[PDB]
Amino acid sequence: GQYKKLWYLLFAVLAVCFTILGYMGSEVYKKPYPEQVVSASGKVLMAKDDILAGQSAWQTTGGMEVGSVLGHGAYQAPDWTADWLHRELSAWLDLTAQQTYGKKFDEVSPEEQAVLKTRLADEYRNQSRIDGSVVISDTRVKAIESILPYYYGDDPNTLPSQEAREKLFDFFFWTSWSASTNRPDETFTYTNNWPHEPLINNVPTTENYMWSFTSVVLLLMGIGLLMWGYSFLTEVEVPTEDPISKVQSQKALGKYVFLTVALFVVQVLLGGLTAHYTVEGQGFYGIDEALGFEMSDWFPYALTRTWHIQSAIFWIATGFLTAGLFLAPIVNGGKDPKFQRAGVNFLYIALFIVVGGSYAGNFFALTHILPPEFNFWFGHQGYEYLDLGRFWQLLLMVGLLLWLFLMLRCTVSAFKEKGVDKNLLAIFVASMVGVGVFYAPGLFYGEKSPIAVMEYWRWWVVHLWVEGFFEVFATAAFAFVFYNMGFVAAAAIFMLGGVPGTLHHLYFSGSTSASMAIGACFSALEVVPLVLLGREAYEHWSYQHLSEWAKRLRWPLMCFVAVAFWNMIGAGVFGFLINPPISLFYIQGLNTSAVHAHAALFGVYGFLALGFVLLARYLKPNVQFDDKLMTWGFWLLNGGLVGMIAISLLPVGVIQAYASITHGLWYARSEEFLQMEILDTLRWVRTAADLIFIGGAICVAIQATKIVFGRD
């Protein structure tokens, strides 16, 4: 502890962000599942048993990777919490159709519809829950009896006194009731008025459009303070004074990248088959005819959706762990422990079986060829990005512990070398610890558990362990590599902004006001680091006239300019578009967020993983590596990306947003809406950009494939 204040710099922001996220985490752990709901007379229709068994069955079926609830999943099949609330609203429109109005929704004229939607609105929004029991009217009993026949188009001894399937729809009805009931002390719902159901009065409250602009005010405060702080005005070379970049376990690391790019290509095959599944889900041009039945049984949309997301995970994950363990032998200085290649291959094949087995379990449970107890563990887990079973999550994190074991083994010498408590060999070994550990948050998670805590612990990995990795490990690797070649804060600001801001997805899943405010504030503060690359991009544009024949690093800068470009675009200006509750209320679970997904995953981290696979370059000479396939890959991947985020997702997304604004979210998700001429033909011409993007993935894939003929 020579200069422990520099440790206290990170310790402070980390302790305050872990206090904020941990205690607002205690707030979303505290602030339900009624033991048994009853009728006005007495009879039961649902129990905690049925809601949690229907949750377990929901997680068995894997409906979260095909039909969204609370906005959190896939966007092919309609939202089974908005659609349920609308179908139950149609049930209340069918029920009271006796006295002061006609039969249908719009059969009664707007003049007399004024006396209609007041009675039901003041039926269930009044607190109807004590004793773990929800008490409901015989009206609501006949409603919950009325709604079930609706649940086609093109969308996927004695003990109890209910069915099993019944438990699923009881869990759906639970999501509906929990979504459409006011809080204690407050006049808004547990979901903060979600979903957008107009006829029950569900729209953002005061805090939403207060903090929506307070976030803008805080962001402009930050921008202003830095920009006016920049007034005082407080290089490794002059014009032409750069040195040459030359240095000569990694036999097996060459296969990690082949795995990586093959998984990237099949990830885009599942992306493309998910693309075709959103055009026609009744057949496949002969082989899957309604008489025949071939493709729809074995490899459905659920499977393409889970496997597209598990491939995106695994190809980028191997795409960075390969770089971690490829740059490992430079950290200690070649200091190889006993049987290191064998351990790296052990880890490699553990990754292989985790990868295969995980989405093979999804194969088995998503087609339901599996018991109840055997789902979740082996089968589909039921959650976006944790689609992989728990067996395989535990095994993946054991792969992360063998990786952190091997990386810590490959930095024991670096840990012995550093006398300074906050050295590069302390930050780049804090980052690897921050990676190899923080997938563990994802395991504090069970099928029979409450869902708020579950998703809290989900975005605790999917927007925390992803963000405290590519902006922390990759950057201390950047410093390390640019130090070792002779070329030469973000972590602290991005883990002060990003760690407590990760709650920006959790506004409409049971969060208190403090969590909304914190989320809003710190998600607003997530922009000011990502916008710093807005000048760094221009600086690059006015610095990239340097490398010639001798300089090996030519095209990776053309990767990284795009990385910074899309890192300004996809998250900074596209994430803060959706950050406000006023827009996220409606946007939550539309094609709008596919733009942010494809543009912030492949747009930022995909090209980064590709750049790190290309960092290939220390096994081939400077003037012998071929680079037409590089430009091919760039033009095709970026043209396909900008194509798929411009031609399709922007217009469909904004159309969907306007439809959600006007007719309602449930309508914006309904098949009557989602099968318009415009939208069907737009989803039909989405595949052009997909062809080009797959072409681009194939180009850079065949580059790294054909790298293997003449290597160093």
Backbone angles phi, psi at 396, to 5 degrees: -65, -45
Residues 654-693 that bind ligand HEM (CB under 6 A): 690, 693
**Of the ranges 189-197, 337-345, 427-435, 576-584, which one interacts with ligand HEM (CB under 6 A)?**
576-584
Considering the rule CB under 5 A, would residue 72 count as an interface residue with Fe ion?
Answer: no
Binding partner selected for residue 693 from ligand HEM, Fe ion, none, CB under the kind-specific 5 to 8 Å limit? ligand HEM
Is 75 annotated in a binding site? The answer is: yes
Residue 74 touches ligand HEM, criterion: CB under 6 A: yes
| Pair of tokens at residue 377 | 């563990």
| Chain residues 463-492 in contact with Fe ion, contact rule CB under 5 A | 463
**Nearest partner of 63 among 519, 384, 449, judged by Cα:** 384
Pairing state of beta strands 36-38 and 44-47?
antiparallel
Cα gap 648→525, rounded to integer Å? 30
What is the rounded CA–CA span in Å between residue 92 and residue 143? 7
- What mask, x for binding ligand HEM by CB under 6 A, covers residues 369 to 408? ---------------x------------------------
Distance CA 288, CA 282 (A): 8
- Give the Å distances, CA to CA, from 616 to 243, 266, 329, 564, 704: 22, 21, 15, 22, 8
Q: Give the residue nearest to ligand HEM (CB).
A: 575
CB of 605 to ligand HEM, least distance (A): 6
Whether residue 504 is annotated as binding a ligand: the answer is: yes
x/- track of binding to Fe ion for residues 425-464 (CB under 5 A):
--------------------------------------x-
- The amino acid occupying position 228 is W
Q: Residue 189 in contact with residue 585, Cβ under 8 Å?
A: no
E strand or H helix at 640? helix 628-643
305 assigned binding-site residue: yes
589 binds, among Fe ion, ligand HEM, none (CB under 5 to 8 A by kind): ligand HEM
Helix (H, G, I), strand (E, B) or coil at 340: helix
Least Cα distance to 598 among 259, 258, 272, 320 occurs for 272
Query: Using CB under 6 A, which of 13, 388, 608, 694 touches ligand HEM?
Result: 694
Compute φ and ψ for 336, nearest 5 degrees.
-90, 120
Question: Quick one: 315 or 392, whose CB is closer to ligand HEM?
Answer: 315
Nearer of residues 34 and 611 to ligand HEM, judged by Cβ: 611
The contact mask relative to ligand HEM for 525-544 (x = CB under 6 A, - = no) is -xx--x--------------
Q: What are the start-end ranges of the E strands in 133-271?
A: none
- Would the CA dihedral through 534, 537, 538, 543 be positive or negative? positive
**Residue 384 binding target from Fe ion, ligand HEM, none, CB below 5 to 8 Å by type:** ligand HEM
Q: Which of 58, 596, 673, 704 binds ligand HEM (CB under 6 A)?
A: 596
CB of 482 to ligand HEM, least distance (A): 21
Q: How far is the CB of 573 from ligand HEM (least distance, A)?
A: 8
Q: Are 355 and 648 in contact (CB under 8 A)?
A: no
Amino acid at 104: K
Enter the tokens of residue 237: 């070379």
User: Which helix or strand (DSSP H or E) is residue 397 part of?
Assistant: helix 390-409
Q: Angle 65-54-297 (CA atoms, 0-180°, nearest 5)? A: 45
Output 140 or 196, the one with its CB closest to ligand HEM: 196
Sign of torsion over alpha carbons 157, 163, 165, 169: negative
Distance CA 523, CA 557 (A): 29
> Counting contacts by CB under 6 A, is residue 598 touching ligand HEM?
yes
Chain position whose Cβ is nearest to Fe ion? 463
Q: Which helix (H) or strand (E) holds 357?
A: helix 340-366
The values of phi and psi at residue 17, to 5°, are -70, -40
Looking at the Cβ atoms of 169 and 256, the one nearer to ligand HEM is 256
| Residue 467, marked binder | yes
**Binding site members for Ca(2+):** 73, 75, 384
**Binding site members for heme b:** 75, 267, 301, 305, 308, 385, 463, 467, 504, 589, 593, 596, 598, 683
**Binding site members:** 73, 75, 267, 301, 305, 308, 384-385, 463, 467, 471, 504-505, 526, 536, 539-540, 589, 593, 596, 598, 675, 683
Q: Which residues bind ligand HEM (CB under 6 A)?
A: 71-72, 74-76, 267-268, 271-272, 274-275, 278, 308-309, 312, 384, 466, 504-505, 523, 526-527, 530, 571-572, 575-576, 578-579, 584, 588-589, 593-594, 596-598, 600-602, 604, 606, 690, 693-694
Q: Which residues bind Fe ion (CB under 5 A)?
A: 463
**Binding site members for Fe(3+):** 463, 467, 504-505
